[PDB]
From Swiss-Prot, chains A, B:
It catalyses: L-kynurenine + pyruvate = kynurenate + L-alanine + H2O; L-kynurenine + 2-oxoglutarate = kynurenate + L-glutamate + H2O; L-kynurenine + glyoxylate = kynurenate + glycine + H2O; 2-oxobutanoate + L-kynurenine = (2S)-2-aminobutanoate + kynurenate + H2O. Expressed in developing ovaries. Expressed at high levels in the head. Belongs to the class-I pyridoxal-phosphate-dependent aminotransferase family. Glycans are attached at N146. The lineage of its organism: Eukaryota, Metazoa, Ecdysozoa, Arthropoda, Hexapoda. It comes from Aedes aegypti. This is Kynurenine aminotransferase. Its main location: mitochondrion.
Amino acid sequence: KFDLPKRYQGSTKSVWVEYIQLAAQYKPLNLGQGFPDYHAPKYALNALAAAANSPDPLANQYTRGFGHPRLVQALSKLYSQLVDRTINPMTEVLVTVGAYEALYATIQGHVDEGDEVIIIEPFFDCYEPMVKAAGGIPRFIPLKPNKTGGTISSADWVLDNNELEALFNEKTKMIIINTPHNPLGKVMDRAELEVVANLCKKWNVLCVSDEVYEHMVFEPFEHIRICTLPGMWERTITIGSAGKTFSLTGWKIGWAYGPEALLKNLQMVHQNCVYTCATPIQEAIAVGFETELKRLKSPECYFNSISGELMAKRDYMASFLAEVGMNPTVPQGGYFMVADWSSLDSKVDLTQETDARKDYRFTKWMTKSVGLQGIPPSAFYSEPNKHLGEDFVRYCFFKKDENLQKAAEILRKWKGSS
Amino acid sequence: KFDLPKRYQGSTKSVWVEYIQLAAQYKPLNLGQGFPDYHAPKYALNALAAAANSPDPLANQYTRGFGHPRLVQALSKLYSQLVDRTINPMTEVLVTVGAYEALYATIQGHVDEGDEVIIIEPFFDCYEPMVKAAGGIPRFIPLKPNKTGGTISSADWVLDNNELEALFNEKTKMIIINTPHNPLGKVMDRAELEVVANLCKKWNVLCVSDEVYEHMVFEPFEHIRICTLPGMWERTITIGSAGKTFSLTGWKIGWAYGPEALLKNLQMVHQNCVYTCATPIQEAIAVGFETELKRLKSPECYFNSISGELMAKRDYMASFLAEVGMNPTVPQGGYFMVADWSSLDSKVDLTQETDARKDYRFTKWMTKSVGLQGIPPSAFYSEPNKHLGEDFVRYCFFKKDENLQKAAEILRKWKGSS
Ligand SMILES: [Br-]
Ligand SMILES: [Br-]
Ligand SMILES: [Br-]
Ligand SMILES: [Br-]
Ligand SMILES: [Br-]
């Protein structure tokens, strides 16, 4: 009967290990998770096969700990252009096992016992347990909509700037931002970025920018990197993911980039966690970046076409969710959509003596009864703020159109025509 | 300039980086890599290619979390027979990013502030920093040879039992064992296994058994798993690696198996560290196990054939090293060989990191002067015990016959057959 006082409390199973099992069990239409239902860019897949089949015996053995040279070079080339600076491929970038381990290396490497970390709700669920495991003290601020009538935009979900500055103090070590945002799809504009950038500069805090969905912003919006703001490069760490950039979530390769001084900490954590990442996968991703770097402005460039591909799907889902009676939040980016479901909202019917956040029971009930899987957004809120996400649900619309129609059908049937 | 990360060990002294840099700069005959310089079993490579090219779009998207179902099934099938226990593929097996992350999850999930962890020297690189990072207190004991019996075998490298028993007390949380040993290649016999087991039972300590080289024991000897000894299953966590099993060190996939009670701790760490591992690699490894499973008792089984392949190379290296005037420790398993160099010491040829350790000096000198690269075993000792490694060098003989030949010819040219 021992105890692991390393701040490894609760979190018995993450929402994913939980819901990934329900999907393996009731095998419904999987609108939960977060990945495409169809094949990723062929050039990327071909490149992995090419690495497996390479005549070079080094292609499937250990590569550099901090990242495959070909990949790191490619990464530098891309982000140097986007950041308007020459990022050193050897010291200002680190390759990791997805954006997950990038987040882990960052939080473990820059938050010590007592350090306060500000997290914006709803948040990608791993932020809080990561900070906790590091001995940090999370402080939460929720995003909230601007009066919801029916269909709104993720731009309508805003935090209270006065509440934000109040959380900043001499103990504040880090703030984590996620743009484009999961699960709302919100794209922070310049003013919103400046608000957190000013606070970071006044209080000397580290900004961690989770930008895995960087290429998935819908017109007329635009992704802005906070590390490009006036004095932010010196105090920002930016994270990306190959699984999101190339729609190959199964490859689990991500990266962090920023000043050599901040990145050193990440390197020490990484080195003593997994040491190195898969070589053939890193090579294939390097080839993929090299492929896109040649056509960065072309409409065939995957960094430019994914949003046009997704936009139609986004609009489709917003329409059938609204038609069924939900109040969807149309995302400015990404492939997630949060919607306010209705059935006990203002039509107090069924009860729940169980008392355990509605969005969890609704979402579960659905995949087990009607065979449509969504995920409960309360899973992305601190314990005392969970209630904020109980009337919602998150759905992924990165699916083949036949499957999107399928969802619309099961929802229309679940309801009634007339 | 940023100082230490934050109460963390800046393991920039990680030997691999400076030795990788050395090899690039002098391009010697490299006996320091730790992986083959030729290709792994074609079925495995072909399996990866097939996964990249799979008609199933989910082949390259997120898989389970605790491990790809097709992999954990195969893992349980193999090890269940090996330990003569039905291992639950879902709760008693955990897939990780190499044996490295398996070690990380085990030490992070079972070592808390103040916990003592005994480490056997020479130790695999990551054992000390991982323990320190977890707030634990390492307690070191070296394996020392018996040089007074003609030639030397890794079996002659032994622990002082009195010293070992004295190291265990109620504060001992964990003991890490590595069999076959890196880099001695020592294979713990049943009696040595019993010494550790009895200690573990007497003081209620968790035994972490690093068995990555489990399939590479040379015929005279046999790999025995401590988790099979009386009362040990309930207190052992055993780790392996696909990189070492299939000679695909760039694939970075490993596992831990043992009671669900012990694995639970690992799961909590893993899920908030990397969450999940590469799907196409895990698929390729699953088919690799499936392939071998079908011929486990046949001599063409890679689990059975690797030792014969390596044994010839081992004998070849032991011979030419003795030729030059070194005294090699012939390993019982694995593909590393430690040898005592009694050649020119820090007298004329040496003059490098003089301050530092002589085995660094010697190894760097031979790379620059002779064009033959080995690794300094001093790197794998605690500071107070480093002197025990200064007389030695680590070579890897998992190399093309022609390169082994070239190494032999370089040493001969350096020397002089009388
Ligand atoms: Br668009
Ligand atoms: Br700056
Ligand atoms: Br074959
Ligand atoms: Br043999
Ligand atoms: Br054996």
